[PDB]
Design a protein around this nucleic acid. Structure first.
Ligand SMILES: [Co+2]
Ligand SMILES: [Co+2]
Ligand SMILES: [Co+2]
Ligand SMILES: [Co+2]
Ligand SMILES: [Co+2]
Ligand SMILES: [Co+2]
Ligand SMILES: [Co+2]
Ligand SMILES: [Co+2]
Lengths: 219, 173, 175, 175
DNA sequence: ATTAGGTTAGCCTACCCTAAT
DNA sequence: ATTAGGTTAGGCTACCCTAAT
């Protein structure tokens, strides 16, 4: 509980929502960042006042070009940090997202560029999330799981884990324990209502809300 | 202008002053952090209220054990970051201290430990400043932290000079 | 923007609110004196520290006896000044309230007493507001003090020769 | 102890010193206003920063035109207030100067003008001090410094003196 | 006067919250 | 999502002071 930089985490969140294909609403930000209704509405006002974003006629949040540009740089900083954190520092894979959620707000554009050099590929984050706006820096999609599951199960390759899932602890640690990592060969079914994955005989039942947050391949 | 974490930079500063052999005075913090007199005196009161430091009978700042502990952890995180930044990331040597001045406030204990591993020696910072409290972590002589900030006078030092009487007691050896 | 004496204007405000039958809340003072929330809450704390007022269990502001006394003395000084300003100096009637809003803070008790003498009746202010705590001094019915400040809406009231529809907020203003 | 408006009493004092023929020095303000040395040197710095006055090469204080202008307005307000206090309000003559020392900082230009009208002559203050800058308004004597010296002044009043041995310092006070 | 170090009153903003709508 | 009323942390200026230069 300390966004480090409120404005940034708000924009990164709208960004995220757009990524997951969800409609950016004050309500989303609220639940996602565990902040009171009044609170987020006001912090957003401030943002709008700084032409960072605008509350549409339909209550949806449209980042101004400038707000959008920043949101993107933060997401980029995040994934780049994650990569460094794991590839170079070798920090525990679970702690990786949290550390980054912090660093994203204090990493310079220079350091970023240096990273690009020092890092092998910078296509995606350790979780398969594509690193954006590498252009501003000046330097294929997988199927949501919720879409690939069936009555009869099938093996398939984990391709992407959304930033929103990385936050769902009990849910994330769980999968992380089934020793599921990007690239894992996993099994998936729509058994009586819910979707589940199984890597090492271990089964992880995805929250209906999260089923959408995991992109898949086809082996 | 954004300490990232006020309390931390205040403590790190008291620590720093102690390092340079200067008496920690609210006044110091003020000039060093370019903050109003009333401001630092207040922020410090807050600190004292949280048993992080106490204003001596002679107005000097004595970090409580706890305060001292944190102050140290910060300095440690700072220098470690610097090392990482230069040795691994290879970020320009002038920008290094600034970046670290930020990272020091968002670097976890683990990352620190991982660093010790991935880093060659962790005796001192790239500026020769001895990395402290590596024990609780569970694991020319030097240009003081205060000089690393003096851009103009430091780059004149890198161009290699006469140092301001104030920055005199800054470079040890 | 210069209360001249902050503490006084805060207490006079609580008094006023009481007059208008409104509940004295930090929020009131905030909007009325156009000061930030944290600000008034702090200045009020200072006040409470000086036993001038106490924030009730329900967040309402109860002036201590001593705070109350002062609040009153200020209201009195205010109305007395207004009377002198109009009756004797003959200063323009709109400017009267403002000038008084200043003088209330620098008028001695003596001057007050002298005014009592030099002035005809000292029952109410030029705007019909009853002048208070005269006992202690040792010597349309009315437009509340809050309305007197509402320049635009007040001059619209004066343009009607009143000694006009009023904003719902200014409703409970003219007794 | 409450200048009401610090900058004003500072400028009014420099003005006053000039009147008494004394050289305006930070030191004077300090003693006259019973304020610490560092305090006045700083407050004055502020003033200078606001082009209200400048500290001469010889440490003397030269009010800028603008500073001068205000200084004048204050003195004007002062004496005008005194006249009203005595002539109209009829407030005790000793208390008169003090009350005015306060009002000078909260009296508007209008009330001043109104005063000009309501008052007989506005040549000098009740103490014989010539009321200045009336021209700008758009419409022998006991120096201001003596009027403050209560003990020595009441000793002067006990002799029935209107516009004995005076302290060598208070000598250049009565013109 | 100035250096040195500190103090109170009086203000503001960015952020967070709960109760009640 | 808003209305209503607070909050803390962190920062600021104007103005006033004692002690030691
Ligand atoms: Co992440
Ligand atoms: Co974050
Ligand atoms: Co450093
Ligand atoms: Co820092
Ligand atoms: Co009035
Ligand atoms: Co007032
Ligand atoms: Co006089
Ligand atoms: Co005065």
């Amino acid at each position: 509980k300390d966004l480090v930089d409120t404005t940034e985490m708000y924009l990164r969140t709208i960004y995220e929502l757009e990524e997951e294909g969800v409609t950016p609403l004050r309500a989303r930000i609220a639940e996602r960042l565990e902040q009171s209704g009044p609170t987020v509405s006001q912090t957003v006002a401030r943002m709008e006042r700084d032409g960072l974003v605008v509350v549409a006629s339909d209550r949806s949040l449209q980042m101004t070009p400038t707000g959008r540009t920043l949101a993107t740089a933060v997401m980029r900083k995040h994934r780049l940090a994650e990569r460094l954190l794991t590839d170079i520092i070798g920090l525990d894979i679970n702690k990786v997202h949290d550390e980054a959620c912090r660093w994203e707000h204090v990493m310079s554009d220079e350091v970023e560029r240096r990273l690009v050099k020092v890092l092998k590929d910078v296509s995606r984050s350790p979780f398969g999330n594509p690193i954006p706006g590498l252009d501003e820096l000046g330097v294929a999609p997988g199927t949501r799981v919720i879409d690939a599951a069936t009555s009869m199960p099938r093996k398939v390759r984990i391709v992407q884990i959304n930033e929103i899932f990385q936050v769902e602890t009990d849910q994330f640690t769980q999968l992380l324990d089934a020793d599921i990592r990007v690239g894992s060969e996993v099994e998936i079914v729509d058994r009586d209502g819910h979707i589940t994955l199984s890597h090492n005989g271990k089964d992880v039942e995805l929250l209906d809300d999260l089923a959408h947050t995991i992109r898949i391949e086809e082996l | 202008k954004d300490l990232v974490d006020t309390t931390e930079m205040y403590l790190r500063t008291i620590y720093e002053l102690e390092e340079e052999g200067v008496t920690p005075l609210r006044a110091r913090i003020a000039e060093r952090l370019e903050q109003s007199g009333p401001t630092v005196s207040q922020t410090v009161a807050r600190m004292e209220r949280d048993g992080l430091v106490v204003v001596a009978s002679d107005r000097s700042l004595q970090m409580t054990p706890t305060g001292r502990t944190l102050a140290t952890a910060v300095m440690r995180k700072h220098r470690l970051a610097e090392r990482l930044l230069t040795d691994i990331i290879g970020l320009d040597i002038n920008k290094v201290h600034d970046e670290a001045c930020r990272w020091e406030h968002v670097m976890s204990d683990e990352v620190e430990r991982r660093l010790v591993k991935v880093l060659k020696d962790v005796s001192r910072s790239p500026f020769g400043n001895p990395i402290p409290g590596l024990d609780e972590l569970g694991v020319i002589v030097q240009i003081n932290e205060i000089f690393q900030v003096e851009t103009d006078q430091f780059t004149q030092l890198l161009d290699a000079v006469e140092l301001l009487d104030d920055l005199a007691h800054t470079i040890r050896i």
